[PDB]
Amino acid sequence: RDLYRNTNTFMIRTPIFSIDNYYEFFRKDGESDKIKDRLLEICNNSVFREAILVSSKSLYSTIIDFCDGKEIKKFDYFLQSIYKYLIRMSMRPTPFGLFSGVDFGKYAEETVISYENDNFKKFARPDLEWIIKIVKELEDNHYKNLTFKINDSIFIKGERALLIHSTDKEDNNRIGEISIRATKPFMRTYDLAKDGIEYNKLKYILIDEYSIEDESKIDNFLKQLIEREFLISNLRPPLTVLDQFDYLINEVKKAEIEIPLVDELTEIKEKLKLYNETPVGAGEETYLELYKKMESVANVKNILQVDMKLNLRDKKINKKIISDVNDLMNILLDLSMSIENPEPFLSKYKQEFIEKYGQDREISLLEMLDNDIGIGPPMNYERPRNNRSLDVSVNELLDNNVRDYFMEKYFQALKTNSRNIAIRDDEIKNLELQKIDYENIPDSLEINLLVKNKSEDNLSDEFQYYIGPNLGSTSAGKSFGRFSHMMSEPKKFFEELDERNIELIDSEEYVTCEISYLPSEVRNANVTRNIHSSEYEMSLFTNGSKDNLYRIKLNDIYIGLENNTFYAKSKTLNKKLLLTINNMLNPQTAPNAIRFLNDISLDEKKLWYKFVWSDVYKDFSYIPAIKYKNFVIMPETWKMNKINMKINKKTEFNEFKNQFNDYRIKYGVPQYVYITFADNRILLNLDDEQCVKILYHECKNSFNEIILNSYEEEGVNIVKESHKDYICELVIPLTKIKQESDISSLSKERVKDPFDEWLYIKLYGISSNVDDLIAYYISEFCNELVEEEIISKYFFMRYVDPEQHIRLRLNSSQEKLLMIYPKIREWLSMIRKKGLMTYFSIDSYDREIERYGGIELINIAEKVFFFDSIVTEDILRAKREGSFDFCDEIIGMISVVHYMESFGLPYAKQVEFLRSQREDFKQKRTEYMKLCNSNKDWEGLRESEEGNILIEILNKRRKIIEYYGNKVRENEEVSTDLSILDSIIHLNCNRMFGIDREFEKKVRALASHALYALKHFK
Amino acid sequence: RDLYRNTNTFMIRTPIFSIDNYYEFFRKDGESDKIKDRLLEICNNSVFREAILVSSKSLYSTIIDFCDGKEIKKFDYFLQSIYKYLIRMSMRPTPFGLFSGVDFGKYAEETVISYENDNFKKFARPDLEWIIKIVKELEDNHYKNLTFKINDSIFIKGERALLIHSTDKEDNNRIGEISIRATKPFMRTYDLAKDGIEYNKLKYILIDEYSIEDESKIDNFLKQLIEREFLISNLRPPLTVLDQFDYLINEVKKAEIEIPLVDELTEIKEKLKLYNETPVGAGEETYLELYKKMESVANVKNILQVDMKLNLRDKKINKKIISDVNDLMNILLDLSMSIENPEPFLSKYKQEFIEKYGQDREISLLEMLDNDIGIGPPMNYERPRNNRSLDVSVNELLDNNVRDYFMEKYFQALKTNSRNIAIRDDEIKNLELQKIDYENIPDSLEINLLVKNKSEDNLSDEFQYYIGPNLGSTSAGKSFGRFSHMMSEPKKFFEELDERNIELIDSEEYVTCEISYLPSEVRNANVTRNIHSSEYEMSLFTNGSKDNLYRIKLNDIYIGLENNTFYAKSKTLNKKLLLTINNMLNPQTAPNAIRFLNDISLDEKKLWYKFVWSDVYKDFSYIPAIKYKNFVIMPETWKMNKINMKINKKTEFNEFKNQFNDYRIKYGVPQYVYITFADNRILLNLDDEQCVKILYHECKNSFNEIILNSYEEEGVNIVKESHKDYICELVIPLTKIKQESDISSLSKERVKDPFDEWLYIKLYGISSNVDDLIAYYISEFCNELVEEEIISKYFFMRYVDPEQHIRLRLNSSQEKLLMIYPKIREWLSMIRKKGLMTYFSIDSYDREIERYGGIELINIAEKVFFFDSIVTEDILRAKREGSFDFCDEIIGMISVVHYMESFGLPYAKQVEFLYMKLCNSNKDWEGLRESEEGNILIEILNKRRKIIEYYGNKVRENEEVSTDLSILDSIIHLNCNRMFGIDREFEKKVRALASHALYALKHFK
C-alpha cells in the first residue's frame, strides 16, 4: 500500500557549469600542467569573475591584481580558494549566490529536462543587515512620527518583565536573567500600546495621569523601552511579506519623514531593477555602482543578497518516481519500530510534567519552561540550561535481534569483500517486528535525490537514486519557502499544503498558525523570510503581516497532555494550534520556547531519516554503502583517527603524502571522494588536491569531521545542454494519504503553608515496621485527637522519594495545630526510641483540585480519604490479630468490588471498566466466584463469621462513597467520573499494600474474571 | 622489572585417563563404527564403574542392568551420559570425584614430571549434610547436656534482634525482615551465654531472677532460641579444623550422651579407614557396605565426599616460567590504566557515604548496610536489594584511543583472514597511557596455565601457555585451601602466606582475620572447609577454631574512609583488619555483609583478569584468539543466535544437521571445539557429538551459553607415563615484591527536631533573585529578631536537592519559636507575592559534630557562621549600591587571605596550605586602605575577625583535634558558598590566584 501522494510540483537544482569544465581543468585534454597558465584562463572567464564578486569582494580584488601581474604575497592561500570555487561551481548543486540555481518542474508521463538559450536569471535584493541599519537610524531620530506596538514575546512575572533574548545586552548582565521593572506607568503603557498608538498620543496620557511636571522624564522613560525593543515601531518590515524593501519605502512615505532619503531609496530601487536585467557575466560594473551607492546610504558588510533561476525549457519527470519512493518509506518505517525510546530527553520530560501537574491541567508555556516558577526545560536544551542536578542518562533500547542482523551483514560484507550492504523486504519480515500504527506516521516530508540514468542503451527510464547529503526535511514546504520570490505563483503552492493539513486533522478543534522570529544577529534571518498561508501568525520582534484579528501572543499559549502526547492551545481563541514554520531555521539554536513548539509539533511521530543502523556502526572507521533495490541510502565512508593516520601540526608534506598512500592501499579508498565539509569533491591523483586534504587534516587536528565519502560513480546525468551534462538534484514533497480551570499555581486554595489549616508530616525509616506502626501507633493517637475535637479529620498514604516514608496529614485551625505540636514531638520521640522510625519533616500540602472534581468536590474527596484510612487500619489490625485468614489478593478483590458497588457503577459497566487496562491463576474459581458475589448483601461472604467480620469493617466506608458518587454525577462540568473512580481505587490499594504495580495489576485482572463468570448471576 | 615472586610450591592437576583413551573411543585405529561393543567394553572397565559409583549411584545401577543384558528404557539418554563422562574422564583436568586428581610440585632447573606405579590415592570423608543431620538429632534429644553460645552474627536493633540469613523461615516471611523480640530475659541470656554456658546453669539463673514458678516457661523459651539458631551448641564442628568428623566423635565423648550411637560412629570411622587403603577400581564392594552403614545411621542424599591424589614420582618445573608470567602481568597492568571507573557501583556508594556521614565518622557495618537505620547496600547487591529508587546507570569510561586500537586490530584480522590478534609492548607504549602506581598493584594472585612443549626437537623447555578457562583467583591460597587435608604439611604453606601479607602492610596497625560462614543449605559448604593461619577468626553459625581471646564478632566491625578507600576496624581491638577467605566461596551469593567485607579487601586494586577489550568485542559473533608472545590469553570463539542459526524447539534433527553444516563452513569452525558448559570437548565429525550439540542447543533455546571455543591444538603434552600423554594444568601462586566518636547517629545532641531549639527553613524558587533576597529581605528580618532578643543567632547557606534553595537556620527556645511562627508565615507570604519565592519546608537539623571539632567546638563554629552571614549581607549590599567596584575574583582572594591571617596560619604555611598590591596584608592592609573603596571593604571584613581568632585558638588548644587545617579548609569552603553559591570552577580559580599572589610577595609577606 502507498502511504504518500505527490503535490503538484517539485524543485530542480543544478550548478552553473557542466561537469566537463571539471575534467578539462585537470589537464584531461592538454599536456600543460603549469601552476599558472590555466590559472590565467580561468580568471579570464567573466562568469567566474562575477560569481566571485557577488560572493567575496576581497578575493575579487586579488584576482584583478593577478591579471595586472602584481605580486601577490600568499599565492598558496590564493590557489586553494580558486580551486575550491572552480570545483564548487561544477559539482555542488546546492543553490548559493551565482554558483547554482533553482527551478520548478511538473510530473509527466516522460522525463525531459533541457536548457534554453536564455538560461540563468538574476534575483538580487537588499540584505536584512542593511535594511535594519536604516530602520534603527530613522527611528532613533524621528520617533515622534512613528506608531508603536508591544513586543509579542513579552512575559510579566511578578514585578519583572522579560523578553526571550537579551536586548541592549551587557556582558555583566547576560550571566543571569535580564528584565525591566513592571512599574505602574509601564503597566499603563502595556494597555495603551496593545494594538498600536501614536507616540504623541501615548506621551500626553502619561504626562496627564502622572502629572510629572518634567516632560523629559517621560521622554527618557519611553526611549528606554524603545531602545530595549519592548516597543516595536511600524517601520520594521515583516519577514512574512513578499518584499521587505518595498514595505519600508511605503512606510516612510506614510510618515512623511526624511524626504531626501526617500528619493535616494527610490533611485537605489531603480538601479537595482536595472541590474536584475543584465545577463550573467555582464553585470560586474553595474554591481559596483549600486554597491557604492548603497554603501553611501548605510555602511554595512553585506548589503546585497543574490539568487538565480535556471530558466529551463523542459522540466518534466516520469511520475514513476513516486511509486519508487513509496517503497523506500515502507521499509524505513517498518525498521523504525525496532527502537523503543527514540526521544529519551522528551520522554523523561513527560514524567516530570505528570509528577508536577497531573493529567487534568493546562499550564502556560512560559511559566512551565521557567526555572523558578516552572519545571524548567528538557535537560538537553542549551539556551537557559536547566539549573537542576537531574539525571542526564538515556537509552534508546534497540532490539537485540536487529543489532544482530546488521552485525552479521557487516561481517559478511568484510569477509566477501563487498563494497555494499543490501537490505531486503523478506529479511526484514523475518524479524517479527511490531507493525506501525497510522497515528504515528508523519503527515508530510521532503526527500532530496540525485538522479542518474542507469542505461541509455536500454532506451528506458532505468534510474539510480542517491539520497543527498542533507537527506531532506521533516515537513513539506520548508525547503521551498526561501525561494517564494522566485516562484511564479507562490500563494497557490502554500494554499495546497494548508488545505491538505486541514484535511488530515480533526475539524473545528484546530487552527493553523505560523511562527515568525527575527534574531538579534540578523544575518541569520536572510533565509527565514518566506510566504505562508496559515490562518494565524505569531511574529516575534517584528511587525506581522496579519491584521490584529489574527495576531497571536506567546503569553496566550497553554500546554497540556492528552493520550500521553503534548498539544498547544490558544486561550483567547479556545482552539488547539497546528504550528508551521516554512523555512529551514535550525531549532537547536533557537530560544527554548521556539524549540519546544517545534518539538511538540512532531511528538510521537517517526523521524524518517533517523536510521536504525547508525548506532550499530558508530565505532567503525570503515562502513560499506547501504542500499535498497535502486536507492543508495548512505554512501561508502572512511574516517581517520590517531591509530590509522599518525599526524601532528609539526608534521610536513611529503611525509603526510607517504603516510596517506599507505592508508589508501590499506582501506581501498578510490580515486574520487568528497571531503565532507565545504571542501567537497577531491581528486586524489592530483597533488594540489592533497594539499587541500592536508590543510584540512591539520586544522581538524587529524580527526575532527575528517570523513571521506565515495562519489556517485555509476550511471549518467539526465540533464543535458546540446552535448554537455549537468549534475542534478530533485526535492520531492510528499503528503500522507488519509485513512478514515482558573485556579493559579500559587493560589492559597491550592498550596497550604505548614500549619495553614493543615499539618503535613513525612515519617522516614519506617519500612521494616509499616503495618504495625499504622495499625497500632498512628491509629490510636490520631483517633484520640479526633475524639477530643482537636482535629476534624486526617488521612495517610505511602510514597517514595529516595527512601520510603509515610505521608500523614492532619486538618484543623492554625491555632489548635500550634497548640498540640509539643505533644506530637513527644509522640514521635517515643516512636523513635522503640526503633520504629528515624527522622521527620514538615511540608507544604499541594492540593490536587482538578483531579477530584474541582473546588467544591475535593472537600468531599478529603472525607472519603478519612474513612478509607480508618477501614485500612481496622483491616490491618484484624489481619495481625488473626481474626481472618484470607490472602491479600482476596482482600484486594473484595475491596475493589465494594468500591464500584458503593460508588454506583452498574454491573453492565464494571467488567468493561476493569478491562480496558492471570487466566490460569483463576483456578480457585469456586472460591472467587463465591466471595465476589455481592447479591442480597454479600450473601456468599456472610456465610462464615470470618467473612462477616470483614464486610462489617468495609461498610464503615460505604455511605460517604455513595454521597461522593451522587455529587460527581450531579456536576455537569465534570465528565468521565470513571477517571475519578479509578483515582480513588489506586489510593486504597496504596494504603493497604504499598507501592507494587504488578500486585495492583493482578488484583484488577483477578477481579474482572470473577465478575465476568458471574454473568449468569450479575 | 619483575613485580612478583613465586612461593615455595605449585599445584598440578591431571585427568585419570590418558588422551589415547579418547581417540581410541572414536575409532582412531579401528574400522568398526558400531555404537555397542565399545559401549560394552567401557562398562566392563572397573575404574570407570567405580568413578561413576562415587559420583552417581543412580547411573551406576543402570550400568549393572545393562551388563546384566536387560533392556534400558531411555538408552538414548544412557548413551549421552556415558559419552559425557568418558570425555570428562579423559580431557578435563579440573579435579572432581575420581575423574581427576591433584598433586603439589616444586621449582627446579629443569622440567620432569612422571607417574609412579603407586598412583592415585583415595581420600574419602563424610559430607557435611550427614554430619549436620546427626548433630541436629543429638541436640534435639539431649540439649540438657550441651553447652551453648550466642550466634556471632546477631544484631540488636531497637527492640528486635536479627541474624544475617533466615532461620525457621517461612516463604511468606522470607520476603521481609525476620526477628525475635529482644525481651528482658533475652538480654540477660545475651550476657550470660557470652563466653558459653551450660543449659542447667543458664536455666536456673533465669528461673530464679524472673521467679517464673512455672519451670516449663523457660524450657519452652530456650528451645525456641535453639531451634532458631540464636544459640549454638558445642557439638557443631568448625569449618576451620582439619577433621570435622573426629571433632564430632570427641565432643559426644565429653558429653557422655547416647553411647549406643558412639560405638556405631567409631565403627564407621574404622571402615572408612580401610576403604581409603583400597586401590582405585578395587573398592566398589567396600563402598556399598560403608554407604549402607552410614545410611543406616542417617538417611540423606550425599553422605560421602571423595578426592584423589595423583602421587607423582617427579614433579619439577623449570623456574623460567616465573619470568614469563611477570611479562604478562606487566602488559596487563599497563592496559588496565585505560579504564577510569572500573568499579562503578562502589564509587556511587562512596559518594552516598560521603554525603551521609562525611569524612570524620566510623559507622557500624550492620547499621550502614541496613535499609532503614542506614543507607542500604550498593545498588547491585541482591541479598536484600536496596529498596530506594536510585538511578543505576553506570559507565566505565574506556579511553577512545584504546577502543580505536582494538577495532583496527579486529578489522585487520578479518581482512587478512588471520585466526589471531597479537598485542605488542611497543604498540602499547605508543598509546601514552598513565603509569600504574605501586599502591594499586594487587598484593597476590593465582594464575591457571595449561603447558605444552612448543616442539620436542630440542628436548628443551620451549613452552606454549594457554590460560585456563577459569583464569585464576584474586588471592594466593584461594585455590589451595580446599585440599588442606591432602597436603603433607599444610600449616607451613599457609604460614608463609600470612607472613608475606604482614610484611607488605603497615606494621602495628593491622591484624589478619579469617571469615568463616556456614550457609543454611549446607551442601554448598563442602568446598569451604580449610585450614588458615590468620591470627583472629570470625565464625558465623558455627563454633570457631580459636580461643575466646581471638574470637571476633560481626557487630564489632566499624567502617571508615581514608584517602577515598574503605577500611574495616575492630572497636574492641582498636585495630584495622586485614581480611582473608582461603576458599572459593562465591561472594555474589553471600549475605550483604560478607560480600561487602570481600569488596573492601580489594578496594582500589586492579583485577588482573578484567580484560579491557572484553567490552569492545562484546557484540561480535566471532572473535579471533588474543595472544601475547607465547601466551594465548583467550581462545578463539564462536557463538550462536537467531540470525545465524534459525532453530526452534519444534525443529527436528537432520534439519539441524544440515543447518549446522552451513554455519561451520561460513564461520570456519574447526573439527574440535569445547561446548562451554559441562559437556565440553566435542568432535564435530561424529554424529552422537552432534546429538549432544542439538540436545544442548534446544534446551538453551539456540542462544543461552552456547559458546564454542577452539581446542589447544598445537604443541605436545609434558606429562608422560612410559609413552602415554596426560593433559596437565598448573596453578601458580605469586606474591608482590615490596618496594620501600561516642555520639550515636540518633543522639539528641546530633539531630534536632523542628522547633527543638532550632528552626530550619528551606526556601524554593529563589534562583532568579538571590543576592537581592539575601542583602535586603533576609537581612532586614532576621537581624531585627536579634535586636528584639527573640533569637540568639542565625546563619544561611545555598544548596541543591535537585532544585536550588536557601537553607535558613534560626536558634532560640522552643517556646519562642512557636510564638513568632505566625509572623514568619506573614513574612514569607509577602516575599512570595512579590514573586521572589515559591514554597518552603521545615526540616530536621543534623549537626556535623565531628567535622568542626567535637561537642564543645561545634558551638563556636555556629557562632563563626553567624558573623560570616552578616559580613556576606554587607558585602552584597555594598556591591549592589556600588560603594565599590572590585571584581568577584578580587573579593574572593581578599576574603581567603583574611581568613588565613585571622585564623592564625602563618605565611610560611599559607602557600603550602593552598594582584600583589591588594593581598599584601602588612601594617594594616595598607596597600588596600589607600582607596576609599578598599577602606570600605576592609572595614566590613574586620567585623568577622575577632570570633575567628577565638575559634582558632581553641582548636589548637584542644590536643584531641588533629589536622586543624581541615577545619580551616571547611570554613573557607562555606564562606565561598554564601557569596557565590555552588560553582566548583570559580573557587578553584580563586584559590589558585591567591596562591600565586602570596608566593610573589615572599619578599614582603
Residue numbers in the entry:
A (entry chain B): 2 to 741, 754 to 930, 937 to 1037
B (entry chain A): 2 to 741, 754 to 927, 947 to 1037
Sentences from the study reporting this entry:
Maddinglicin A (MadA) produced by Clostridum maddingley belongs to a group of antimicrobial peptides, the so-called lantibiotics or in brief LanA1. The first necessary step is the dehydration of serine and threonine residues, which is catalyzed by the MadB enzyme in the case of MadA. The structure of MadB in the apo-state was determined at an overall resolution of 2.7 Å. MadB is composed of an N-terminal glutamylation (residues 1–741) and a C-terminal elimination (residues 742–1038) domain. MadB forms a homodimer as already demonstrated by SEC-MALS with a bifurcate cleft-like structure in the center.
Similarly, for NisB a RMSD of 2.6 Å for 1383 Cα atoms was determined. This indicates that the structure of apo MadB adopts a conformation in between the apo structure of MibB and the substrate-bound structure of NisB. In the apo state, the regulatory loop is stabilized by hydrophobic interactions with Ser154, Glu230, Tyr518, Ser521, and Phe542 as well as hydrogen bonds between the hydroxyl group of Ser180 and Glu178 (distance of 2.7 Å) and between the side chain and backbone of Arg229 with the backbone of Thr168 (distance of 3 Å) and the side chain of Thr168 (distance of 2.7 Å). Surprisingly, the comparison of the apo- and bound-state of MadB revealed a RMSD of 0.2 Å for 1792 Cα atom. The only change occurred in the vicinity of the substrate binding site. More precisely, a loop formed by residues 164–179 had to rotate by 8° to free space for substrate binding, while other minor conformational changes of MadB were located in surface-exposed areas of the protein and are likely not relevant for catalysis. Interestingly, only at one side of the apo-MadB dimer a tunnel of the GDs envelope was evident. The tunnel is protruding towards the corresponding ED of a monomer indicating that space is present for substrate binding.
